Structures are given as C-alpha cells and as structure tokens.
C-alpha cells in the first residue's frame, strides 16, 4: 500500500499544475483501479519548460560552469539516490505497468543503476581530436553538448528508457525536458524529486506528463529543442522525425520495434537454446523492444526443439505481479490484448500447428509450428506471447530469410560452431546480435536497430554522440 | 571542350531516360547551351537503386572486396581525376561561371585530396571491444549502411559530390548520385572515371534530373539506406521529412547560413580585410561558407569598411577562362534578380551603399561587388541568405555583445574571428554556435577536418574521421561463454 | 597524531620485516623522529610478488571481477581517502614539511581526483576491431601486464603513488609499492583503507625501506611484469637498467626537469610574477614541477625581476600546520646543505642576489625565499635542478632565441608561457620540447590530462587516458573462417 | 645473374665510403661464395648519420614542414618505387639469405609495398585529443614526432623488419639511422637509392651498415637518438636496451623471440592443423620469430596427429633458391646448424621417439614425439626444423603450460568450438593469438610480443605509440 507523492509537472526543481488545470489518471494493469491523477500538460507547459532548460544551458550558467567531473558527480549521486528508494521506484514500476515486483527490483532499476553509474564515468572523459594539417595551422575539434534535448518514452520500460536518455545527455552537459508515456508516468516523476535532492541546478531536467499528440507532439515541434530521443512505435517515431524535419531540423534518436530473429543451428545446446528463446519471447509478457517474434530451427533438430519449447510454456508460472512466484504479469491495456489472439487464429487460417494454447486465460503462453516466411504470425510483430517456429535447411538460406524484414534491432543465435556463430554475426542485418544468450544488455555496449528498427544508438561510447555537436576550430599562424 | 558524357550511369553502361526526355545545361557566361543530358525519373531511380542493391548483396565482388582494396580503388579514381583535371576542370567552369583556375586549383584540389584521404581511411575503419564479465566476449562492428544517396547543389556540384562519394565508398556502400539539374557535366563524367578506374558495376550510379522528380523518388525510394543531401535549408526540411515518411532512412545534411565574420579592434586588419572580402565574394559570393554578416568593433569599423571598398572595386570580373579573373556570373537569371532584389532592400532599409549596388553589363548575368555600411541586425541584408557578391558590415561595442548577436541566427555552419588575442580568440571559439570556427582566416577545409552545421544549417559532418559514422552502422556482437 | 601503521602490507595483513630490522621516519620542522617502520628486504620483496601473483591468476577472485566492479572497487577507496582525508593529510604534512593545507587541498584532491577519474576507466578499456580480408575476423585485447611495481620519491609521496596505483588497479593488474624510505606514513596508511574498501588480498601490497635494497629487489625481480619509477634522473637509469638485465618489465619514468618558464612582453605581468613565483617555490621549490629557468624578455626585464622579489619576501614561512604558512622546511639535511651549496655557486659565478640567500633560523632547516638576476645560460644556477626556493631569472630578445635556448637542456618535463598574443602563445607551445606546456598558468595538472617527460625527463605518460596504455598489454585474436 | 649497385654508407642521400676505410664481405648462404664487398661502419659513420638525421628534423627543415598528407604521398611514392624494381629487392633478399626467390617476390616485398600504403594513409589521421578541463580551461594533447630513431634489423626477413619500422616512423615524421645486420645489408642499401629517387629531403633517412658490437651498439647508445626499434636476439635486445637506459633513456621498442605454442584440440581440423603447424614450424627453414616450437595436441587425436605430421615433413621439396619447386632453402649459418642437431640429440637422451629425420643432409625436416615439457627441445627455442609434439588432457592443462615461458610472442590454436576458441585466445599470455591459420599477418594488426618476447608494437595504429611523444597544451582564460 504505496502513496505517491508526486503526481504535478515538474520545471525547475518546482512543481507545477497544467496551465490548463486538466489532469488525467493512471491506473494498475493487475488491478483494474487509479491509483491516482497527474497533471495533463499540453502545448503552454513544455513551452514554459523548454524555456526553463534554454536558461539553464545558457553560458554562464551553474550548469554550464561545472567541471566536467563534477557533472559526474552529479550523476553517481542521483544513481546512489536511485539506489536508496529502490524499492520506492520498483513499486511504482509494477503499479504503473504490472511488471513483476522482482522484475522491476532486479531488471528494470539495477539497469537505471548501472546506466547511471556508467555515463558518470564518460562525462570528464569526453574528448575531441587535434588534427594535423599545415605546418603553421592548429586545428582541433570540440564536443560540446547538442543544447535541450526531448526524452519521449514508452510504457514497456518506463524509468530505463529514461535514463538510457537521461544519463549520456546529462553527463554531455545538455538539458532535458522529458515526458514519459500516459500510461505510467510515475517513476518519472519521482526521479524528478531524486533530481532536485541530488543537486542538479534547476532547469537541468524538467518533466511534463501528458498524452502523445498534445506534449509528445509539442516536443517534437517545438522551435528551440535542440534534440530528441524517442523509444516507442515504428510509426510514432516517423511522425516524431517528420515533425522534427518540419520544424528546426533538430536532431533525432530512434529506438522502435523489430521482428528479432532467432536462430537454432543443429548443433547447439538445446536446452541453452529453448530457454533462452523462450525466455527471448515471453519475457516481460512478450512486450519487449528486443521481443523474439521469429525462431528459425535447423532441420536436424526441428522437431524435438519444438517439443522442448512447449514443456518450456507449461511449466511457466503466472499471476499477481508483488508475488515472489511470478515470471509473467498481465499485459497492460487490451487495444492489443484483442489483436494478439486476432493475430493467433492468422496462423490457423494459413497453416501452422498449434502445439500450445491459442487463447486467453493475462493470456496462455502459446505456442506455433511448421510456420512458414509468408504467414503473418512470421511477418508483423506480436507485442505478445506467441513463438512463431520455423524451418531452415542451410546458413545461407536462414540469413537471408532473416534479413528479409525491414527491420533489425537484435537477433540471436545459437550454436558451439566457431565459423557459424561468426559467420552468422558479421551476415544479420541487426544492431545487437546474441551468441548463446538472450537479452544480454550492458551500460557499456550500445544498443539500436538497423534498417527501419531506429537510428543511432542507445548505450556505450556511442551513445555520447547523439548528445553533442562536434565543432572544428581552425586557426591560422602567422 | 566537346562533352562526351550526357546519359544516366548504371552498372557502368550509359542509358538512356527511360522517358527519353532531356533536358538542356545552359552557361553562365556565354549565356548558351552546353547540351542536352538525360531528364531521368522515379523509373531512371528504380533502375539504378536495383543495380545498388545487387552491387551491395552480400557475395557481390564488391563486398568480398579487401579494405585495402577498396582504399586501392578510390586512389586509382583519385588518380584519374588528376589526369583529366583540366577536362573536368573546364566542364565545371562552362557550367558554373567557375574562374577556370578556381575550378583547377581549388575545387578539383580538393577532390582529388578527398579521395585520397579517404582512400587510406578504408582499412582503419575500426571498431571496438567492449570489457564486460569474465565469462562474455562482446565486440562492436562498423557495417556499412546500404544504398547510399547524394544529392548535391549547383554551387560545388563535383566537390560536393566527392565529399559524399569517398567516405560512402571507403566504407563500402554503394551509391545512386543526383548531380543538380543545373550542373551534371562533372558528375557523369566522374562516372566515366569510375568505370576506368574499377569499380565494380552497381557500385555509383548516377540519374541526371530535376530535385522534384529524381531528388524525390531517391529521398523517398523504401531501398535506399542512407541518404546525404548539400543545397537550400527548405529543401534540407523537405528531404529529411520523405527519408521519415517513408523506410526512416539515415539522413546527413549541409544547408546555408547566416555565417558570422566577426573583426576585433586588435586584428591585424590588412589580413582581416582581405580574408573577410574573398570569404564575402569567392566563388561569386555563392557558397556554403561565404561570409554574410561582418562584424566589426567600433575602434577600427569605418577604416575597415573604407579598406575592403578598394578590394572590392579592383577586384576582376570577366570571362571565366581568362587568366586574370577572380568574379564571374551568377548561376542563372533566377539568382541575379533575386540578389538584385535584396541589394534593392539594403537601400530601401537603409544601410550606405559604400560600392558597386548595380549589374555590370546588360547582356552578361554578372554582377559588380557590392558593400553596405551601418547596416544593422533587423535589416533584410543581415538576416536573409544573399548568395552573391554582397558585404553587409555591422558594428559592435562588447565581445559578449557579438556573440549574441552572431547566435542570434538559426544557422551556424562556419564563423571566423580575427584577433591576435589569445583568450579573445579562444573565448570567442568555444561560444560561437557554429560547426567551423576559423581564426585569421577563411574558407581553410581540409579533408582530415570534419564540416557541417549547428542548428538549422545541417546534421552530421562531412569530411574527416567524423564522416565515416555517417556511412556505417554500428553493430554490437555480444558472446557469452559455456 | 598517533601513527598507527608501520609494517609491510602483504595479502591485506601486516608483517614484521623478514630481517626483524627497523628504520625510522623523521620530521622535517621538529626534526624529530615520529616513529619507526620496519626496514623490508629482497626476502620481503620476494615475499609481496609471491603474494600479487597469485592474486593475478587467472580464475582468482581479482581476475574473475567485473570491470565495473573493479570500478566501483577504486571508488570506494577514494570514498574512504576523503572519509580520513584529515589524517592522511597530517601524516603527509609530518612526513614532508609540507603546510597541512597544502597538503589537504592540493596533495589529497588530486589523490582522490584521481582515483576517482580512473575508476571510471575501469569499464570502458576498449581494444579494437580490425577489418582485414572477407574470411578473418581480426581484433585486439587491451589485456593487464601482472604484476606492476611502483616507486614513488618524498616531494609528493601519496599522490605520485596514487597516480600509479588507480590506473594499474583499474586496468586489473596486481602491485607492490615501496615509498621513499624518507616518506613511508602515507603509503601505509593507504593500505589500511586498501582492505577496508574491499580488494582482495594480494591486490595491492606495500615494502617500505630503502632503494639499493628494496627498490633494487623489485627493478630486478624476474617475475614483476611492469615499473613504474618517479624519482632521479639516475636511479631512473638505473632502474631502466635493472629492468632490462632481467626480463624487460615494460618502464614508465616521471624523472626530473630544469622546467622552462618564459614571460613574453605582453604578458599579464602581475599573473606572470605571481604564478612563475609560486612556480619556484611551491612545496619548498621540491617539486617535479619546479620553474627552474625564468626566461623574460628585456621589455620587461628589470622590474619583472623587480616585482618578484617582493613577492618573494612578504611570502610566509613557518610551522607546516600554522593555516598562514606557505613554505615549510627542506626534507632533510642532505638536501637543505644541497641547495645552499648552490645558491654560493649563484654569488661565485656573479649573479646578482636580489633577494634571500641564506637560511632563516639556525635551529631548523628553513630557507628563506632567494632569487637571483642577470643568469646567464652557462651558470651553475641555471643547468642544474636545484630543488629548492630559488627563482634564477635570465633574459631574451627573440622568441626563436628563448625556444634554442629552452630546448638546450636534456630535460623537458614541463614548460609555462606567458603572452597574451595568440602567435606567440601557439608558436611557443608547439615548438618547446616538454611533456605539459601551460599557457598563463602554472602547476595545472588535472586528472584527465597526461603528465611526464621529454627527452630525459621520463617514458610514458602518467594521468590520463594515456595512462593505460602503460598499464596494459595489446594482444591480436585474428581468426580464418572455413 | 644481378649486379649489386650499392655498397656504401647511405647519408644525407648521398653515398659514403667509410671514414675508417674498413670494408666487409656478404656471402651467399645457398652458394658458398660474395656477393660483394660492403663499406662497413662504426662510431664516427653513425655520429656522421646521427647528425645529418637531427638536422632534417630541425624546425623549418623542407622535411618537418611538409603537409601529413604528402608525408603520405612520399610513403605511396617509396611503395610505388618498390613496386617497380620488386624483383630486383626480392633478388638481392635472396642472395643475402637465401630465401626461395619466389618467397621473397610474394611474402617479403608484398609485406613492404602493403605495409608502406598502409602507413601512408595513417601520416594525415595521426590525432590527439581535446580534453575536457574546466570551463575557463582549453586542454589539448599533441602527438608530436619523437624525432631521430634507430631501427636494428635481423638477418631472417631483412627488407620487411626494416620497413616495419621505416613505414611508421616516417608516416609520423621523425628521421630515422638504419643499420640491416652484416649478414644481409644489401635490400636496405637498396632501399636508400629509392628513398632518394622518390624525394625524401637527405637527411630523413639515412643507412649504417656494419656489426652489432660496432655500429649498433654506436647507436643503441648515440647521446642524440631519441628512439631505437631493434628486432633480434633476446640477449641482444637486453644490451640494447641497456644502452638507452646508461645514456640518455631513448625510447626503446623490441621485437625478440619465442616458444610460441601450437594448440590443436580434439574437435580441430586435423588436415588444416597439420599443415598450419607444419608451415608454422619449417616455414623460412625454421628461421622465424613466429616459429613453432611446441605443438600441444589433446589426446583424443595425439598420436594420428603425430602421423599426419610426418607424412608431410617427407614430401617437403628442398633445394636451390632460384627454384620454382622450393619451399625450404639454406640456413644462413653454421654458428647455429650445429646448435640445431646438438639439440636434436637432446631429446633422445631425455625420451623422445623420433618418428622424422634427426640429421644433416640444409637439413633433413624433423618431427619429434612422446616430449615432455621438462626436456630441453621444449625449453629452449630451436631456429630451424624441428617439430617437437606434446600431450594434453585438459584446456586449463594446456593453458599453464603454453603459459609456463618467459616468452609470449605468437600462439596458433585449432579447433572448430566456439568456446574452446575464445576462452584459449583470453587465456593464452601472447601477442598474437591466430585461430585456425598460422603467420596471418596485416599491416592493420598489431604485432609484438608478451613478457620476454618484446616491448611494444609494430603493424597497426598501435605502432604509431612508438613513433610519437604526447605534448599536453593548457591554457587558462581570464
Ligand atoms: N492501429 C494499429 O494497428 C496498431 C498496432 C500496434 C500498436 N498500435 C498502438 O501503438 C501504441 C504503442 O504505445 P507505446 O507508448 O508503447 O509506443 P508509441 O511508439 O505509440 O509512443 C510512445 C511514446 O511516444 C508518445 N507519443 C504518442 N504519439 C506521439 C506523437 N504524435 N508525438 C510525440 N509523442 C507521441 C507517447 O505519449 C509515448 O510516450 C499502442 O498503444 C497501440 O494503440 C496500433
Ligand atoms: N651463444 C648462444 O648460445 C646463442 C644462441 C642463439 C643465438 N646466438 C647468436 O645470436 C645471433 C642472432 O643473430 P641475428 O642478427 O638474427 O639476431 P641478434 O638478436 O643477435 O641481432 C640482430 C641485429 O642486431 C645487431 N647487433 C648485434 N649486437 C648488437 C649490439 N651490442 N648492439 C646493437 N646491435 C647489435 C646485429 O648487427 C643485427 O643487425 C646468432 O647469430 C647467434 O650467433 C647465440
Ligand atoms: Cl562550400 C566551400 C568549398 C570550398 C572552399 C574552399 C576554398 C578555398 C580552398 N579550399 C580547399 C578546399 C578543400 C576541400 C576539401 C578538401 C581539401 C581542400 N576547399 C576550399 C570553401 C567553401
């Protein structure tokens, strides 16, 4: 029995209710109820915190003026603050999307902790280049930060996907205006608080809950963002980037979906391979940016695979998400929940063997088979807990059936095979390729899609140059 | 000069406009046809995306190329350009009213260094390995992206298309290239070159045509990847929002500028004049980098502006291959009037006219150079991208004062300052929002340093290490152990 | 001040020396003795590397740690160093003479600085992915080197250790430390909070004594991998050497330097005295650092000489924890008769004695601030690193002239200049042969920024992230696909 | 039938007879008989070089104000100079050593005319940083030249371990004293002419042939020479580096020998392991800092391994030079031919069946079994033709073996297990570590040795650490 505290628009380390006076509730997936009402901001809100970052990246400001290594600072103190109210945030994390409580606990914030703690690191540490060029030229480069910057998020991985965001931008020295999903706003909000106590100067960070095309959009307009970062839809992100084109040319991250291939080569560890690809689909209910939607097999152990998987389904325990016996929750709002089992009698029509579930119950892990590239349960991406298995004779074959999508944010593979794995890796068309592991994510190796699955990345030293404009400076002696 | 090359490069054959429509390449100077090229079309794009991708499938020759090999090949092009540099120098000028020796010495200089920079970039192109825990072994490839595509403008059309071309083919993509309708003569004859020197078919294909027919149907193609567009802010907007609606192509992106040229009462005033007038006026005052806004402090503003007035007057206009000019015309008719027009607005606002002000001759396209006086921030010749020979001067009072006043913009591709103050130079360096920042100089690029525009005035870099993460993917292969 | 530790840390626990021998520390202003620490041995030495190789095996809890952990492993050390950072600081102070405020702002921000920049290092030690033919995959492991050894001199015993131990520790290597026999209280107590933070036994381990004896033990030991040597020009020689008769452990030197400090015409006058005056006398002029040749142009010569000299005398000396101090006493005897042998070589061969010149109490072993006025090149006074309060001032006329004559020497470890004039300031910096060139500064090191030697003056680099590459050993995989 | 046109010491691009008057002999290791007589040097020749070689490096010198990029154009121009007249380089190689001619063609010169193209793209992309400081603060580091370095050369691939290091160092811009071993002078001296032609300023680089003690000890202690590069004898790097630290601490790089170990497990390639093993051994007769001496072979396949083995070592053809039929020629001297066969008998004192060869005949290609790690042919490195085999139970078996040297140059493991491959290249203490190939060598990849075996790197970015010293400029504003 949490209280939340924070529920208004946060700007400059103050809180504030929509200039509209609108509000709107969030409530618990588990739990049809609200748990409570957030101030709604709309247009004249982020106006007011885009002005507010503007000031606060101005030169001469306490931001600006800090030392790099106090940037840091700052940012091992708001990932100690994390770490302190742990639970705090987990528990808004369930309560706002129905993740399991340990999920929250031990996924979602020890990955808010590590990202954190991680760009702290990289912000005294982020260096330009001396160019040579003529005898009696110094030439040299600057990376300076991008200016304001717009975090948008989804309501998969609420509080991570922001701080993948927030962590590079700040220790960059840009300033944010963020605006989390409806869906679950709440530890967004309490990281504002966490904001303000660890010492970030006012204005560094504001937040303005609200609904897509009214603050999204506002975002994504708005004259003077100077970037932005969104994780969300394929087609939420296109308007995103064509509103950022219409209007001042800002700079855009994109993290969307993928249909993420699975590949089982003969000789692989079975065991290794079903679970993992098992956990690669269903985990987090199969709503996962990196969600498992296509598991190719090898002939030689097709048909056994396929049995593993479905013992894998049964035995898989689900229920209410604070119990220390869950693996999966419910899924967080039915829009889709009637599109998942739409798209489960799609595999019935075209043929498919369905060895496991195939209806509601939260919703039954299901399972499919002798599924072919053509069907649809093999051609657009679930969002649900469905394992779409099918049937590949040679390694050239698989590769370009794999690479067949327009998209391409991961892709795993699994095999003891020295020249397979590497042969595999260098050929899929992914931003992150897994060898014998699923959802292997670290702070210090970047993370995006190919081909329409985004653009840029997410996580590592790459991560650092979405979030700074590089500046050549040349000059000449006499 | 006898054009050879007027037809759409595909595979290395030369086709003609599936429409069979041309169009006609007219010179600014002699005021006349060149020729007539191939007019191509979203069919001309189709069939030449198709011969990229198969250039780019995976097995191709030219994927199973070394690094080294393709470093071998863009040397061998850079190579070919130097022996027909006059060639190629001549047909830029015909097209441009280019100073024949600025195309040979400047321009083809350029291309030719480009290519050879990048050339040696091929086997360097390097990623990283990542520590992570004992048991996991985790690496990053840099990939390339696909199909790239370039669409260049009038004022730099080979050099433009070069700076896209090497680093896009060092990393070992494949290219559709859109030369601008009012100057294809170099592109296709490159395409001539990159036949000689190698390249496997499909690997540069190259469709001649208009921005709303080929520059549309390759921003908006589904198959291409990638696509790096120089030319106008508007059609900068334009293209970034087809690359969104339709597959989210990688977008690069050089525009125009407001670019500041900011004179300290401590410069040495003689280099400040003569740097500040060839960045006004170089290349007939259209180019991405020519100086639009010339700050000057109080202490030396009027002597200053007498000083660069005599540049001016001297400076040579004429004929484009004679020897001894430094000015030639503008573009077409549709710039002349529309910088004549703004001349007219700088009047009409009223900043002194301290030279020039009219057209040199009535029949030719030039344009005698022209210098403001008092103008100030809200005047239309301070705000608003002339593009001709046009030095609106302003006057300032504090360094805090200029830099303000120059970030008042929303561009920022290149700046200079001239002092001979240390922390006024550098002072001024880190707070000007612009993405090159000369210091008592002008127009110095080099193909190891990275250019391109803050704000407004463009996304990403060209030219150094910077631009090979425009044309690569960053991969992340992450191996746990048993 | 009770000083609790005084033997050899090995494997996190406290050892009585082999020899059961003692030695004693002194204290440079009570000239008293603080206490007595155990004298170690090779048999110690042998001891402590038996201890960190097998705490670098792999498989060890050490090795099998993440590379963030290892991370978090230094910052929690550099918690603790800021938890007793007044201790330390006072241990520091006794050891030295240094004023306890020097110490606790200077000495120990930088230890925990440092720690703390190198720490962040830990998980972004990144190798590289290198493309080489189609069927290869071909990358690069910035694995540790093993066992390092560190030997650190008295002018700053905690921070020069430090400077060493965090980026060593935080690429995964082991270590054996010996502090100066002159300074041993800090090394020690460090040890205290090396297993207090947490790292394993045999990480980290610490052999006070002395250099012929223990110094010499791990510059020759067959099984330490890496030395990392501040100190003499000579026992630089000679440690290089030992370390190339046995099993050529790679060498990093931080040596000495007769460290140019030239004012140009232009300069900030009053910043120049004031910074090229504490330049000299810093931590009693005992210091790396230490401005040994104050070239000044004849423009203003005389009363830069003139405006030092004030400075100099109005400077405060005395008791090290007395807050008004800036100048404490010489380290020990052998150094205090060292320094006033060479002031009299000042007077014998004619520099005209501006200021000071002999020692201040009879009792103590103070100096009183000495500067010195028209040195020539050939002087005593102006080729060899003094290491005390004297401030040898000499005269140019070009700046070509004082770049030959700075670069005259062997050394090269830093250099500051003075100028406001951007020329100058860039002309000068890239043409003097040193290791840190500060511009309108001095003794401004931060932890990001590389620090070493020249030419004589050291191999390597300390503090950056160039401090690395000392630290670890670059391996190639390079794989061929069937 | 080839003329040898240069014999003299190489200075200021100009040709040099020796201020002593001395002269020496190069022999032809395949044809007892000279080739020629060769100016030989000593002290007042390399103090002569030293000084010509600090004056192209002053400040203002046509050498030191070239643009980095036609730096580069030079280095292209020396490969293209190499390119033509290859033939006559890869002649001259084999007359001093020996080496088959079309060894020479296709290994040595291809090794120089890539490893110079490879260094000339690296002359304009040499960078430092820009540091982040404080805000009133501009740090940037500088990767100035070193100035003049020495570069001391074997016998056994004579051209290629000069251009190793000529390549690097000149792309960086410092000049340079060589001094080829007396054995094999003559592609260095050649290589002079083609330094000239090409239009290297005189100075930049110029040539000292003559004896270690004589004239690469006048350098390994020169009081200006800032940097040596020395690839040879472990006991003669020691001196060498000894030398720098008695006189004046120059910058010492070393590029010794090793017991480079050869790992094949159960699951390898056995043909592909047999041959690579082979080639690794026996390639260059032996004579090769990467040569294999100790194949480490898992028992699962040990003693058929040991069979393949000999089998090839039988038909190995062996003869002249010239020859279009050769892979093995003459060892280039007697000093060690005898070594060799005292160390044959070596390990049948302590038993070793000798399934091969075991004597002269050149010499007979021999393969060694049953050995052991306490016998002396497993404890000592050989320099020729001798394969001794061993046995091993246990990956961590074999990893504390093969780690048991005080050497770690290379190390070639086989097999087709992705784990097996990755955990033996983390474990094994060598710079190199080839799976399942031998001797892949590229200018882009690193090459040196771990532990005894060398300081330092040749071959890839990491090369230009030796060949540049970082210059750190800050500048407080006011
Ligand atoms: N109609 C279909 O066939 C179909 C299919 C799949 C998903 N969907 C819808 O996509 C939605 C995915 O929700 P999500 O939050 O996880 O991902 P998302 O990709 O839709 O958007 C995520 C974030 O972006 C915000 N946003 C929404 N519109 C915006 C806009 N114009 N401008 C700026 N920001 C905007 C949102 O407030 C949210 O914070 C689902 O809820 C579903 O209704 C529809
Ligand atoms: N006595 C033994 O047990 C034993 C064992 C193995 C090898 N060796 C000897 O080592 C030699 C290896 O010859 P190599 O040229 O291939 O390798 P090397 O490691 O001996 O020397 C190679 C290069 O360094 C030069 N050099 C020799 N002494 C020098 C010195 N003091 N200072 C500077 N340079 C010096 C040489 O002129 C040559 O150019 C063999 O010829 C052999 O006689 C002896
Ligand atoms: Cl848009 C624009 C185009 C060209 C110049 C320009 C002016 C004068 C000299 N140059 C040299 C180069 C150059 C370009 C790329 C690689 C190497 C050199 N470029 C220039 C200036 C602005």
Redesign the pocket.
């Known amino acids: 029995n949490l209280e939340v505290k924070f529920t208004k628009i946060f700007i400059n380390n103050e809180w504030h209710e929509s200039k509209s006076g609108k509000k709107f509730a969030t409530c618990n997936p588990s739990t049809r109820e609200q748990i409570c009402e957030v101030e709604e901001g709309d247009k004249p809100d982020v106006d007011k915190a885009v002005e507010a970052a503007q000031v606060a990246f101005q030169r001469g400001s306490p931001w600006r003026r800090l030392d790099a290594l106090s940037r840091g600072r700052l940012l091992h103190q708001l990932a100690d603050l994390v770490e302190r109210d742990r639970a705090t945030l987990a528990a808004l994390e369930t309560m706002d999307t129905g993740k399991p409580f340990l999920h929250a606990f031990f996924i979602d914030l020890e990955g808010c902790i590590r990202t954190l703690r991680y760009f702290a690191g990289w912000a005294d540490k982020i260096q330009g280049k001396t160019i040579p060029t003529d005898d009696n030229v110094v030439c040299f480069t600057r990376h300076e930060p991008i200016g304001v910057c717009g975090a948008?998020?989804?309501?998969?991985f609420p509080l991570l996907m922001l701080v993948w965001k927030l962590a590079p931008a700040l220790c960059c020295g840009n300033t944010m205006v963020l605006?989390?999903?409806?869906?679950t706003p709440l530890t967004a909000l309490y990281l504002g608080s966490l904001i303000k106590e660890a010492g970030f100067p006012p204005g560094v960070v504001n937040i303005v809950p609200?609904?897509?095309?009214t603050?999204?959009?506002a975002?994504?307009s708005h004259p003077q963002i100077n970037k932005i970062a969104?994780?969300?839809?394929?087609?939420?992100?296109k308007?995103?980037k064509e509103?950022a084109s219409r209007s001042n040319l800002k700079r855009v991250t994109l993290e969307?979906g993928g249909k993420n291939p699975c590949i089982v080569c003969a000789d692989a560890d079975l065991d290794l391979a079903v679970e993992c690809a098992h956990q690669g689909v269903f985990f987090n209910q199969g709503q996962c940016c990196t969600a498992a939607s296509r598991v190719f097999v090898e002939e030689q152990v097709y048909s056994e695979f396929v049995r593993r998987s479905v013992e894998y389904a049964k035995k898989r325990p689900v229920g209410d998400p604070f119990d220390v016996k869950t693996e999966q929750g419910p899924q967080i709002?039915q829009?889709?929940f009637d599109?998942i089992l739409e798209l489960i009698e799609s595999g019935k029509k075209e043929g498919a063997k369905l060895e496991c579930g195939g209806s509601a119950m939260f919703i039954k892990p299901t399972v499919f088979s002798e599924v072919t590239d053509n069907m649809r349960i093999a051609k657009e991406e679930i969002?649900g807990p469905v394992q779409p298995i099918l049937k590949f004779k040679s390694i050239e074959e698989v590769i370009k059936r794999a690479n067949s999508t327009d998209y391409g944010l991961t892709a795993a593979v699994f095999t003891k095979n020295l020249d397979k794995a590497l042969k595999l890796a260098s050929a899929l068309e992914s931003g992150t390729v897994w060898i014998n592991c699923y959802n292997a994510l670290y702070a210090q190796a970047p993370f995006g899609g190919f081909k329409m699955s985004g653009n840029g990345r997410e996580l590592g030293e790459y991560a650092l140059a979405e979030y700074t404009e590089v500046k050549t400076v040349t000059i000449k002696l006499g």
């Open positions: 948008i998020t989804p309501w998969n605006k989390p999903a409806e869906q609200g609904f897509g095309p603050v999204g959009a975002i994504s969104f994780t969300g839809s394929t087609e939420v992100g308007l995103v509103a969307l709002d829009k889709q599109k969002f």
